[PDB]
Structure 1
Amino acid sequence: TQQPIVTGTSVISMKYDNGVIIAADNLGSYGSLLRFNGVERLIPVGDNTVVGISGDISDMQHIERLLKDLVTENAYDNPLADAEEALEPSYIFEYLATVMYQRRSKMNPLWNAIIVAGVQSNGDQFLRYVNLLGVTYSSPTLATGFGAHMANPLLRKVVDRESDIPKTTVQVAEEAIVNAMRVLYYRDARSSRNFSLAIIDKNTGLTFKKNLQVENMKWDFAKDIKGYGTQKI
């Protein structure tokens, strides 16, 4: 049993017609202190999977190393390591899910919430969640922390059920994700303007976008707001 120290906030994601999108800001918070401003919380595994992690950063870095070691180990005595016997999103997820549930069962959890986004061999979209309790679930949209409360409602307006996935393009999905990240910046006190976004498409492959910023923000209406009730000046 521990407590989280340096933490990363929401990770949000969604499925679209040809793949999945995942995003997460670049902040490492130390309680209310916005301590670290250059933290990458999306970690690619090969060219078909991106693992997005929220929660304790020290445990994230540990998981980051487990995945790096997983790729190394898979290549051992494997002539098809970059082809048929390459790591799949489902393999990577189930590994993590096994680790998370074992650690919680020893009362020494990895204090994280993880979303594994990727595209399988057969072109199928993969999107599944796992956390410190070993709880797992899948949905057309997935989000951690504050993202669950504020991002999912916005992303579910685009893909409300399974049948909406083929009707959703990458431009629409990316737009929804970017808007959701802005909303989180407005309303989440442990979020940052700077974020990373990753797209895993079955045709165009893995696109990893760094140093993205929240833009087109509305603040002008603040000038008119005065006092807390009766004050006019």
Structure 2
Amino acid sequence: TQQPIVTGTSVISMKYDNGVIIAADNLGSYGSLLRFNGVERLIPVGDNTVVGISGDISDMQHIERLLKDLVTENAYDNPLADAEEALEPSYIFEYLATVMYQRRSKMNPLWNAIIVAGVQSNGDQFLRYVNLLGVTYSSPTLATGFGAHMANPLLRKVVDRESDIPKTTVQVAEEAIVNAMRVLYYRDARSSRNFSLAIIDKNTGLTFKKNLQVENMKWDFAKDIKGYGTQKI
């Protein structure tokens, strides 16, 4: 049993007609102190999977190392490591889910919430969540922490059920996610303006975008708000 020290906030994601999108800001908080700003919380594995992690950062770094080892190991005595026997997004998730549940069962968890986003070899979209309790689930949209409360409602207005997936384009989807990131920056006190976003398309492959920023924010109306009730000036 432990307690998280350096933490990463929300990880939001969703799937569209040809793939999945996943994003996460670049902050590493230390309680109320916004301590680190160059933190990458999106972990690409191969070119068909991206693992987004929130929660304890030291544990994230540990999971990172676990992931690199998976890749190294899978290549051992594997002439098809970059083909028929390359790591599938579903293998990566099952592995992490197994570790997460084993660790919680030993009462020594990896204090994280994880979303594995990717595209299977047959083209199918893959989006599944696993957390420190070993709990797992799938939905057209997935978000951790604060994003679960504010991002899911927005992303679900785009893809409210399975049938909405084939009707959603990368443009529409990426737009939703980028809007959600801005909302989170407005109401989440542990968020950052800078974030990374990744797209995994069954045709265009893995596109990883770094150093994005929340733009087009509305603050002007703030000048009109004075006092907390009766004050006029």
Q: Above 0.5 in TM-score?
A: yes
Number of aligned residue pairs: give it: 233
**Aligned-pair distance for 1:111?**
0.1
1: CA distance, partners of 2:190 / 2:49: 27
2: CA distance, partners of 1:43 / 1:167: 28
**Aligned-pair distance for 1:132?**
0.1
1: CA distance, partners of 2:230 / 2:68: 59
**Aligned-pair distance for 1:151?**
0.1
1:80-126 superposed Cα distances (whole Å, 9 cap, x missing partner): 00000000000000000000000000000000000000000000000
SS in structure 2 opposite 1:151? Answer: helix
SS in structure 1 opposite 2:147? Answer: helix
1: CA distance, partners of 2:68 / 2:147: 27
SS in structure 2 opposite 1:182? Answer: helix
SS in structure 2 opposite 1:97? Answer: helix
2:102 is matched with: 102
2: CA distance, partners of 1:43 / 1:116: 9
**Aligned-pair distance for 1:28?**
0.1
**Aligned-pair distance for 1:22?**
0.1
2: CA distance, partners of 1:25 / 1:193: 7
2: CA distance, partners of 1:88 / 1:132: 22
SS in structure 2 opposite 1:22? Answer: strand
SS in structure 1 opposite 2:185? Answer: helix
**Aligned-pair distance for 1:202?**
0.1
1: CA distance, partners of 2:217 / 2:50: 28
1: CA distance, partners of 2:3 / 2:221: 40
**Aligned-pair distance for 1:171?**
0.1
**Aligned-pair distance for 1:162?**
0.1
SS in structure 1 opposite 2:82? Answer: coil
2: CA distance, partners of 1:19 / 1:87: 17
**Aligned-pair distance for 1:229?**
0.3
Runs of at least 4 residues off by over 6 Å: none
1: CA distance, partners of 2:224 / 2:203: 49
1:181-214 superposed Cα distances (whole Å, 9 cap, x missing partner): 0000000000000000000000000000000000
1:131-159 superposed Cα distances (whole Å, 9 cap, x missing partner): 00000000000000000000000000000
SS in structure 1 opposite 2:59? Answer: helix
**Aligned-pair distance for 1:179?**
0.1
1:85 is matched with: 85
SS in structure 2 opposite 1:66? Answer: helix
1:30-67 superposed Cα distances (whole Å, 9 cap, x missing partner): 00000000000000000000000000000000000000
Q: Which runs of 5+ in 1 are unaligned?
A: none
2: CA distance, partners of 1:102 / 1:131: 12
1:191 is matched with: 191
2: CA distance, partners of 1:142 / 1:224: 37
TM-score (structure 1 length as normaliser): 1.00
**Aligned-pair distance for 1:217?**
0.2
2: CA distance, partners of 1:231 / 1:89: 57
| Identity, % of aligned positions | 100
2:74 is matched with: 74
**Aligned-pair distance for 1:221?**
0.1
SS in structure 1 opposite 2:66? Answer: helix
2: CA distance, partners of 1:90 / 1:73: 17
2: CA distance, partners of 1:203 / 1:15: 14
